[PDB]
DNA sequence: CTGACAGCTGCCTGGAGACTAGGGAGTAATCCCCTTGGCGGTTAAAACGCGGGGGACAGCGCGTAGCTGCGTTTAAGCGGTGCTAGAGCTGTCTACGACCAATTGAGCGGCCTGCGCACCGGGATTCTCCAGCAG
DNA sequence: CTGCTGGAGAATCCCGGTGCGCAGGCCGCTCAATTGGTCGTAGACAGCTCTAGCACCGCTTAAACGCAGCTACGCGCTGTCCCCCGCGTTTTAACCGCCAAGGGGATTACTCCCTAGTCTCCAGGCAGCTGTCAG
């Protein structure tokens, strides 16, 4: 019952679901390995976000359609597993 | 065979004319039977 | 100076829907796609020229990228309205 | 260590998002490690795009043009 | 006659 | 064709087309050798062998 | 007199005609290929831009956002055909 | 295919002392019959259809045949088909085309089975061409003297 | 003698696996091929070289969406592949 | 040329199936991988004949094909280009 | 007279690539270390394909390539898999790989 | 009659300092001839947008090296990349 | 308070106007290479049973691990302030690439020829299977 | 009743031999690299300017984590039953070969002429600014 009223209340709104100090914090500590003393445009950060959600939320998807495949509600890690395998980013 | 003669020369091939004129010399109704006519 | 076509997306837009407006994020938005189907174009259009062993990009080029690219009612219409816009120009 | 700012409710509103009802408590990890990879290619990308320019810092142009290339274009910030 | 590191 | 004319005209024949088996060519060679009212016997001229 | 006008259409045919120049596509560009790419972007502009528009009427709401240009993206099938791999910026997703 | 029955129905009737093989019967049985087929002295003559030989001219391309048969080599008449291409290069001490018309369309048919039979006779089938496929037929359709 | 199920189907699998050879007779897909085209353009001729690189092309797509299949069908548990399978994996690929 | 999608024989696609690692086949298999085949064959055909139409010829050549692939996503080597 | 592969030491041709950028319409203007320096790289990725070919072929008791063993060394090599993913060879099949699943 | 340019006896040079001993057929040496190409044109399509972005009128070999970066993986990469200033340096050298 | 439309400013750039070089039409013309309605074989891939072994599917019984409710604990977020690394822009001037005559040799097909490879034929070895037996 | 090997049947594997057609080479020939020039100009490089990206806090407070309670379903265990597999027997269609007369229709080469490209000049479309106003 809550889950579904969460649902329509995320997939009603377009606000970033991920908080954007931790995303920050990420990406600068991914991109410390690449690069020292790396400056990001604000922009670009939330470009990244933007592009990070929109990532995450369709292979959710995806784990959600196998997870109905398998006769489960529940998501399992297996599910990540398989979308991202039929997907070819494997 | 003078209908297939005329439409020889304008799409069928010399070939598809030349089959088309051998069964017209064999027998017409090769192309369309004679109908059986009945009330509507 | 900057070159954009938010000019002329808010002319289309007032031709189509005189009333309604359109937010800035939407606006770069119609700018993104705008510039994006241009590049699918042309490029499309540059590899269709250099695989015909052609020099000049002409609106032949054009419509066959056009074909290509987009989908069929979409492809159909755009063919049809680049056809009369080509022949209204050449009628000046 | 901060790929543990991206918090379980975070992935569960992800989630929801995307029309998951019930999520597995070892999701988490799984979709840490997801997002770990692809942050890692798209900056990677990113930071090779500011080094040819020259340039000391990543603007958004370089993310767009990374995610263009990874085949996800991106709406709203080249323009 | 020749070799790449990549294999090394 | 030639079947409905022979028949409409009463002449009594046999038909191979080539479609016939092989030992039901041999028959209706024999047949024909044997048999005295068969007046034609319509053939394909590719067929036979 | 414009060449755009003259061509009847709205978008910039002479930019166009820059862009393809400056842009190494090919070493000719001929008179009718600009007028062409033109009309075709006028075409789509229009066609994206009318379903946002109904979108936004379907919203109660004035002026086109990003949510709306998705929305018409989404539901249109040879729209969304076209800007499959696409991702737009605060766009979110189909209602579900 | 269907003379085969015949041939060997002749063969059995004049000359009972030859080993006669039959190559009819399926990929099964033929192997069956194959085995053990390279110990000299297991058969004198085998009768084969030309589907087979055009299917099977793996096999038989390798072996040293003494003599070649082609029974209605009309089969052969035309160089272009892949009967002849497969059959040209064959290993055969001797060669012998049975027909009944050696001639049946143009003259090429005619060059056709003299090269199988004579490669080194009639290496050139253009030049034979020349030589005298156009003036024959020009002498036919009266094109020439 | 029976060979108990699944033996020939694995020895079939090794054996499709080791060679390289087209699976679809030509004369087949040809015609396939013809049908098709003749809807978009009539009187349109096809070199031997375009259809060979087009079953080529197709063989290439079908083994690759029936090896996402029997993945599908490993995941729940399973062994014999149902058109769910094909379906959801064409659904994941980004198709229809 | 008529009804033609029925010469997607099926052992050729239980070979295919073989050949991509299945061991057991659902007897409905079969139509679903005809039309994905014929949505296949559609798409890339219509490319193809696109670009002949443009060269203003009436054969299709295997550069044609070549490129339409390559468009799809799906570039196949050993045939030129 | 001096050729500018001999002068860089590559086998592939500088003269040739450099035509080609000119005429691909890439650029109004091309420099004189690119054509080199893409020399350099299409003969380095030649050259590790091959390798990996040639070793395939080997381990198939083969001494010319046949495009089944450049399709096994694409394969097997993960970062030429990735490079070559949406590539289809001619006449490639497939790798040998046969689930645990399946397996008696 | 007429002119095609391939890679052919380049390619049968490398394959020839690579592996001395082994050989390819045409249908293998036309699937590597492709293989170049379809690297050329990738290369190439991937330098000119970099110099367009930048907003430079050349190609040069910063460009072609960034391509390189761009789109061979990690260790290809770097190894190509090895090889190219090598190889320029080695061109410099020899004026 | 706050984004968006508009009146106005300054400016870059696209609209006229000329020659004109050549990229792209007309015009053979050669030749390969089919092209397809009707025929006739001929098998070997398809197609159709059919007994049944096993896998898909339907339950049942857990029993636990995800869901829900409550209270802390904290860390995101916002609001200035504030300090500088660095992006953006501009003038010089060389180094470098665009063209352009002469070369000239390296790269095209044409023609040949070993020989690598595909495949036949015994003999060897391997994989799977149930029957009957030992327990 | 249950786990075990043995003999056997099918299946590759593997070593000789051998025919074939294809790659690798070599040889004329030419056209596009190469070399030696000129000669604009792209951008490499100082040098200036001012933007925003980072480092900081103090307060709000809503979200996140942990704990307790709890029961819904993932999974193991049974019991099917149906349906697809292995293989034997029958169908038929690639496909191959005629049979024919001409018919495209890519190609190479010639000619030749509209239409871009380059150059020049000048006025209008437009980027952008803040003022103003509805939300
Ligand atoms: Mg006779």
Redesign the pocket.
């Known amino acids: ?3 579904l009223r969460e649902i329509r209340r995320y997939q009603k709104s377009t606000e970033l679901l991920i ?4 995303f920050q914090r990420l990406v ?1 500590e991914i991109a410390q390995d690449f690069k020292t ?1 790396l ?5 670009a950060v939330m470009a990244l976000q933007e592009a990070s959600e929109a990532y995450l939320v369709a292979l959710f998807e995806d784990t959600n359609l196998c997870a109905i495949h398998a ?4 998501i ?1 890690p297996k599910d990540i597993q398989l979308a991202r395998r039929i997907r070819g980013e494997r | 065979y003078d209908d297939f003669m005329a439409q020889t020369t304008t799409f069928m ?4 004319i ?3 004129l051998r ?1 017209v010399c064999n027998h017409p109704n090769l192309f369309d039977p004679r109908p059986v006519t009945s009330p509507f | ?4 076509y ?3 997306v ?1 002319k289309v837009l007032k031709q189509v829907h005189p009333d309604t ?5 939407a606006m770069s938005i119609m700018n993104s796609f705008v510039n994006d189907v241009f590049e699918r174009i042309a490029g499309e259009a540059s590899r269709l020229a250099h695989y015909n062993k ?3 990009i ?1 609106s032949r080029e054009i419509q066959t990228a056009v074909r290509l690219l987009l989908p069929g009612e979409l492809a159909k219409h755009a063919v049809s309205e680049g056809t009369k816009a080509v022949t209204k120009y050449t009628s000046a | 260590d901060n790929i543990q ?1 991206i ?4 992935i569960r ?1 992800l989630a929801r998002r995307g029309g998951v ?6 999701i988490y990890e799984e979709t840490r490690g997801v997002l770990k990879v692809f942050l890692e290619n798209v900056i990677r990308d990113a930071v090779t795009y500011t080094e040819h320019a020259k ?3 990543v ?1 958004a142009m370089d993310v767009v043009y990374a995610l263009k290339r990874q085949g996800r274009t991106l709406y709203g910030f080249g323009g | 006659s020749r070799k790449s590191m990549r294999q090394s | 064709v030639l079947e409905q004319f022979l028949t409409y005209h009463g002449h009594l024949y046999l038909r191979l ?3 016939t088996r092989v030992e039901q060519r041999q028959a209706l060679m024999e047949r024909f050798n044997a048999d005295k009212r068969i007046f034609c016997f319509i053939l ?1 001229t ?4 | ?4 006008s ?1 061509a009847g259409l709205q978008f ?4 166009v ?2 862009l393809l ?1 400056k842009g190494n596509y090919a ?5 009718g290929a600009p007028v062409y790419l033109a009309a075709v972007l006028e075409y789509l502009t229009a066609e994206i831009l009318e379903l946002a528009g109904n979108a936004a009427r379907d919203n109660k709401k ?2 086109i956002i990003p949510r709306h240009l998705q929305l018409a993206v989404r539901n249109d099938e040879e729209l969304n055909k076209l800007l499959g791999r696409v991702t737009i910026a605060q766009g979110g997703v189909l209602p579900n | ?2 003379v085969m029955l015949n041939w060997e129905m002749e063969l059995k009737r004049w000359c009972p002392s030859f080993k006669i093989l039959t190559y009819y019967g ?2 099964k049985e033929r ?1 069956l019959k ?6 000299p002295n297991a058969f004198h003559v085998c009768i084969t ?1 030309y ?2 030989v ?2 099977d001219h ?2 038989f ?2 072996k ?1 045949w003494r003599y070649l048969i082609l029974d209605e080599a009309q ?1 052969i ?2 160089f272009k ?3 002849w291409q497969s059959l040209l ?3 055969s001490q001797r060669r012998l085309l049975l027909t009944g018309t050696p001639l ?3 003259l090429m048919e005619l060059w056709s089975l003299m090269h199988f039979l004579m490669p080194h006779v009639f290496q050139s089938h253009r030049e034979f061409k020349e030589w005298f496929s156009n003036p024959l037929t020009g002498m036919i359709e009266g094109s020439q003297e």
């Not at chain 1, 400056?39 to 922009?43: A, H, K």
């Not at chain 7, 070493?27 to 008179?31: D, I, L, T, Y």
């Open positions: 019952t809550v889950a908080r954007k100090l931790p600068r003393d400056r990001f445009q604000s922009s006769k489960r509600v529940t399992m | 091939s010399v070939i598809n030349l089959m088309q069964k | 100076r900057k070159e954009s938010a000019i002329y808010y407006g359109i937010s800035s994020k052609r020099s000049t002409t | 700012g918090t379980k409710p975070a509103r009802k019930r999520i597995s408590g070892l340039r000391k810092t603007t | 087309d080539g479609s394909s590719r067929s036979g062998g | 007199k414009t060449r755009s003259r910039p045919v002479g930019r005609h820059r120049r070493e000719r560009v001929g008179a004035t002026r | 295919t269907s399926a990929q192997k194959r085995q053990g087929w390279t110990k259809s589907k087979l055009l299917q793996q096999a391309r390798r040293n089969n008449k035309n088909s892949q009967r290069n064959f290993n049946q369309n143009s």
